[PDB]
Amino acid sequence: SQQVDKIKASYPLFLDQDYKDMLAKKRDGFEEKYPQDKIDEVFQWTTTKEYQELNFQREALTVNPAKACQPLGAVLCALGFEKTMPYVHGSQGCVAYFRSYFNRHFREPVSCVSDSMTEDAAVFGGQQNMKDGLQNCKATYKPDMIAVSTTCMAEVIGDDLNAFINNSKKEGFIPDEFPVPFAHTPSFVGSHVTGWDNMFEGIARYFTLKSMDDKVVGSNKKINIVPGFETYLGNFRVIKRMLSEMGVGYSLLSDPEEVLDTPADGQFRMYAGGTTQEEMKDAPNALNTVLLQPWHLEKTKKFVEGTWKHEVPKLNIPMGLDWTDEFLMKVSEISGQPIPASLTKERGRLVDMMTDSHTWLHGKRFALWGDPDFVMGLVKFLLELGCEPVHILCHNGNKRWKKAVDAILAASPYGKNATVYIGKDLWHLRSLVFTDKPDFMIGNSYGKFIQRDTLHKGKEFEVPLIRIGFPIFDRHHLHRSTTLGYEGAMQILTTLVNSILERLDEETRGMQATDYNHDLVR
Amino acid sequence: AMRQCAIYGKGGIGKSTTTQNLVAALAEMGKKVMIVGCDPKADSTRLILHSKAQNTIMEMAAEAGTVEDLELEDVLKAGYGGVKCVESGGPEPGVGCAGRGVITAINFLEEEGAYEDDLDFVFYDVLGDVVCGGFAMPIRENKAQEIYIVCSGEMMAMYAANNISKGIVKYANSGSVRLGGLICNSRNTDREDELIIALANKLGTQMIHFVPRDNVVQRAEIRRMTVIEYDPKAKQADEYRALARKVVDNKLLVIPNPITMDELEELLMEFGIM
Amino acid sequence: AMRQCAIYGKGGIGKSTTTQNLVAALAEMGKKVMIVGCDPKADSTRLILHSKAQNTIMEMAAEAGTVEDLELEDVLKAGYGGVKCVESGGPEPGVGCAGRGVITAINFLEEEGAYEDDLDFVFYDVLGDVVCGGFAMPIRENKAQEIYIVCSGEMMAMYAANNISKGIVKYANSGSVRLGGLICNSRNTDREDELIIALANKLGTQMIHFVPRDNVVQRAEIRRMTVIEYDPKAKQADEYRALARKVVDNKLLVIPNPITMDELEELLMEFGIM
Amino acid sequence: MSREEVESLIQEVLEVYPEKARKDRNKHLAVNDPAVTQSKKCIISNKKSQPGLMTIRGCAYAGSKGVVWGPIKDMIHISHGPVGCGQYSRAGRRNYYIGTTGVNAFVTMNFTSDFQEKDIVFGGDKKLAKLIDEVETLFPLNKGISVQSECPIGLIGDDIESVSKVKGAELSKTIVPVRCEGFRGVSQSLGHHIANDAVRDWVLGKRDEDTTFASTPYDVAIIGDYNIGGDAWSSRILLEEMGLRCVAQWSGDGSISEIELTPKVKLNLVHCYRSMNYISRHMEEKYGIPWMEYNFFGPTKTIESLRAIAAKFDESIQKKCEEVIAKYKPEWEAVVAKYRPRLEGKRVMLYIGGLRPRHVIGAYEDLGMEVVGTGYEFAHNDDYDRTMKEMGDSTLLYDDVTGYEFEEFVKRIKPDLIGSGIKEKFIFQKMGIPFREMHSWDYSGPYHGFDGFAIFARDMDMTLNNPCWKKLQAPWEA
Ligand SMILES: Nc1ncnc2c1ncn2[C@@H]1O[C@H](COP(=O)(O)OP(=O)(O)O)[C@@H](O)[C@H]1O
Ligand SMILES: Nc1ncnc2c1ncn2[C@@H]1O[C@H](COP(=O)(O)OP(=O)(O)O)[C@@H](O)[C@H]1O
């Protein structure tokens, strides 16, 4: 039943007695479910160390992974170029998934195309699909460029992207000079970030490899910046802002901030801003190239150093205090520009916030996961704050990265109880937050299910989730935030401390029980 | 009744030629046979249809939209001796996935009940490079029950035979498929027969028959026909007749016992010199 | 300098054996060569390494975790005449996907810079059934610049040769790969030499050389070596020395001109009989 | 208005496509007409999507694992292949269930083989076998396992059925191999079919010889309701209120045991014809169980369905059916009295999967709104035959519409509201057109039955008459 004045959606609604009675009869009559005692018993069991060992012995089963496949990253990278249409050679089911995955995080439109290879195309190859596909896309969506990546199907059967594109041109399906960069993006190799790296290197090669003759390093007096897979709009903006504030000439290669944040003014814009073709062709003339997230821009680096001859600095992602400082000093050394009073003040303000909030952050244990560069940045910042990262999980991390994170952890007394796990998933992390409870965990929306599980064991065992990372589907507009630079550090810091204070207020809200510590001033 | 067999072996060893010539003999004995070609090149039924088959399952499915719109009559043809032919079909060399082509072809035939009730034999003629799961489709559960590996006294051909045997063990343990024996399609090497018999014994099977190398096979091939139809009186024609009976009466069906590379090198040294 | 070549052709037509013998000749001439085996069976380097190599890229990568943790030294070995040998590797027959393994193997060689600066030649030895894109990896852009198709007067072998020629066109039109010619590895058929020459002319290429069928090849093979090493004075040894020179001095590189099945039947009837 | 203008609009739109695509797409756009009983003379459907035109269609995997199998509570569904398919489809469909996630229920979780390069090159059947053993250890309360094939599994020919049979016998468990390789078919549709067949082949017959189940003359089964936002539960309460006993719900809050008990029911009530007609037709020819399509979207349809259903039984059920209708009458009448005046005359354009494009029209009309355009992502022609009667004359119909087409159609038709999926939502909102997700209900309560109609009405009004739609244009820009 419903009261027209106070209509109930599923949550309140199914708590009405008639619905409870019904679900009870459904359960007992036909579900043949295990007794509640057995369920609780098994639940408890899944929270012990005995279960944890069995859990960590897994060799074939992955449960609740913290990573996506390559093409997802290739698409995001392509969206960063002006009037470019991400084109994924292979099955259409993929593209439907890449779009909705991004639609949900950015809550924005995401344009991506597929050449819908079906059964017979998997058998005879996907060249026709490429010829008709490139022609149809160009005519219909009028892009100025089509960036081609692949689905696993096309990768297994070894569809030759280069040969298909070249023949599509030779046969008149698209103009000879129309830019069609491409990249092989194996869903069974690496993760989404590797896709971003491959797609970018493929785009840089297309506009640069065959025309290096006239290029001179440093001639355009700019600094190229490669963001890598980034899903925080504020990160693109803060980098542009800091460089311009230093009066430093820069070229951001792959800039999707505009297409991922168009205005709702009565008009739909499929394309907006983005890195221009001229900027990419001119990139070799820059003074140097900076890679914002080195741990997943490995292929790009190799190309930029070998072909462009730029001495890519060994810099960590500019997160936290020390790495942002290092980033600025390097940029200053490469461009000759001094660090302005402006940025010096901003740095001092962050330090102020750190000092003002250090007593609440000290000793707080955290479990966290995400992509390589992001996670390392958080670890580094966490340590500077006097926090204790205890479980560091990076599903798509590798041995070298782990070695580097361990070095950052050993250089700090606060990294004494931290462990770095690679190739582990959220079900592994679930075990860790039960057997070795942290105060909070930092990760994407997938961690909500972990907070749900911990609370089920009891309020005192609950581990609240702090939403930072990708993807974030259960909160609105967090993709507008910033995690890079002093600005990003200020946002992360405010979030951590207030999360801590929130939980403290929740635990002491009980009247004549715990409210003796429900202070107005914290 | 109804026996399903699958033919494997070294590339170009002569399994399609032998298969068609053996089937012609089988039809001559009054048996009802159907051969299923499982090679991108649709050349496993040329000698029976007296022509290169053009209505392959894959190519026909592509035109009809989906394999779900395909109908047996369109791809099933009859030839010499009433022998029925079907070709999986596949991509030209260097593109596509021929393995998926066979997976889809066999599944189509299974659902269309092509493997009708009154057939006496069904032969799956597989290419020589079983480089994937799709080409093992013929020996999955409820398919071919016996496998014949064609080979010769050549070192490489014997290696491929032992290699294919390792691959068979999986399907033989999970199902009921068994190796029925080795067919030596002579290539005039030294002590050829001794080599094959030696390998056979090692694997735990038998050398079903020894098919002499005869240019008559080629002459009949040029004309688009088996020896049996080209020259019934030909000495080679009787070779296939003998093979046919050996196959019809064969009762030795085993699970291959693969040998190591060193055992094979050793085997060659002993029975291959002189 | 530095010429990359790919060998293709009918299954079991003799490409792995001819290549190794041709290469042994090349090294005799003082040329530096690398042979890249692109066949699941890692058998394209036995006559040069005097043993079946076991350190295949794919198997080595499976052990080291990923191909990214692999290193040239572990899979690249030098053999007779200083010839360098690498094997793609793959699964046992009937499972997995050997095509993808080749794609991965080739890229690893590319990224590890195996194709060193002072090599004179690199030969990709490809299996006989190019059933997918993976096996065309050798002839994609910036790889093999010349292709040699090995065949014989046998109807099925010439059909495979023409069929492969069709698959080459996509790659030749999009890149710089060209057909360098047909190598006739004789199998004693009638008017064999005329047959191959006619087909070559039709395709628009040439019959580079005619290797005779000689059991000495088998005796050398049994002892795990090429004829050039086994018996330098052998008449067959000189046949390979002549093949080597024809290859080194070859300047005819064209785009295959595929013929229809009917044209092929008509060609067999004209130059095949008598 | 006027099919003349609509047909012209269709032609104008097709002007941008290259010849080949133009000719093909033309067969998928049409102007409805109430009398044609055979839609193959008006529109063609269930065909391949033209390459590069940005369609909204999914794959067979989404159709198998995403809609049919994933809903099942106490079974573990393994996305066999590279990590990815499984990650993107994790908890993306709101098929609601009651259970203790991670111990006796696993709907919201993503189990996968996470294929790496060596798994593709060397095969993954051994990995699948080991994976099944790990699942049995860590999740002892699972009542069955299914393995949903992703693209690569279909190409390399892994022998999943063999592993399913072997491990199945060893562990004494139901292990269902599903060959839903993405590239099969042309949409989510073939995945439904493959899924139904797997149920039939590996699960449905389990209790053919068992007779310990105590049945009644009133046993029914609801099939084709995935309990989106609780849709199935708010439907179930109505059926049981009029005296029926729902022995099973197919895949929404469904368990494997109720699936196994379906062959014992007296009548199969099918909501989603597109995805479940296959198994409904099989249960009729094998068990003699009749089936009938129903519609619980809006009061007119719900009341019509309750009466048609009740007619299949005796008088006691028909009496209870009228009692159920009398009970809710005041409630839905109150809903219309309040929301119809706010929605009256507003025009809507829809584009969904294979059922709702046609099924929700009545509820819209119950609020006085008119559906000016409708279409499906992957419907067959038997779906379009059922659609022409529901749509008004001279209305627009589109099959597997492209991004460009949909956008251009909306610009000219200028509907007051659009009901589609998440991939369209943000485009139209930018254009200033109220949009409502007709798949996930935009995370809102149920829309089925009488209780859902009230939430349906409140949602349509909340969005359509929101004040933001007036602010799109900056004051300083006429
Ligand atoms: N016993 C034989 N005598 C003469 N030629 C033979 C014999 N067996 C096979 N051949 C020849 O060898 C070629 C390859 O045979 P084919 O059936 O294609 O083998 P595969 O099925 O292994 O490819 C054919 O052209 C045929 O002339
Ligand atoms: N010129 C030749 N004379 C005699 N036998 C040969 C000759 N060339 C090849 N062979 C034989 O043919 C067998 C298979 O050839 P192989 O090199 O494996 O070719 P492919 O690589 O096409 O399979 C070898 O074991 C060898 O005995």
Ligand code: CFM
């Ligand atoms: S797009 Fe239903 S045939 Fe299927 S997930 Fe939605 S209009 Fe599906 S009603 Fe259903 S619960 Fe659906 S909303 Fe048939 S199940 S493949 Mo996307």
Ligand code: CLF
């Ligand atoms: S059509 Fe459908 S969703 Fe696509 S792959 Fe195939 S079953 Fe799966 Fe999977 S991992 Fe990523 S998302 Fe694709 S590239 Fe492969």
Ligand code: SF4
């Ligand atoms: S090796 Fe087999 S499964 Fe792999 S792409 Fe080639 S034909 Fe297909």
Ligand code: ALF
């Ligand atoms: F060379 Al084949 F079958 F024709 F192995």
Ligand code: ALF
């Ligand atoms: F059988 Al092969 F090259 F070894 F064709």
Ligand SMILES: [Ca+2]
């Ligand atoms: Ca938005």
Ligand SMILES: [Mg+2]
């Ligand atoms: Mg053959």
Ligand SMILES: [Mg+2]
């Ligand atoms: Mg070989």
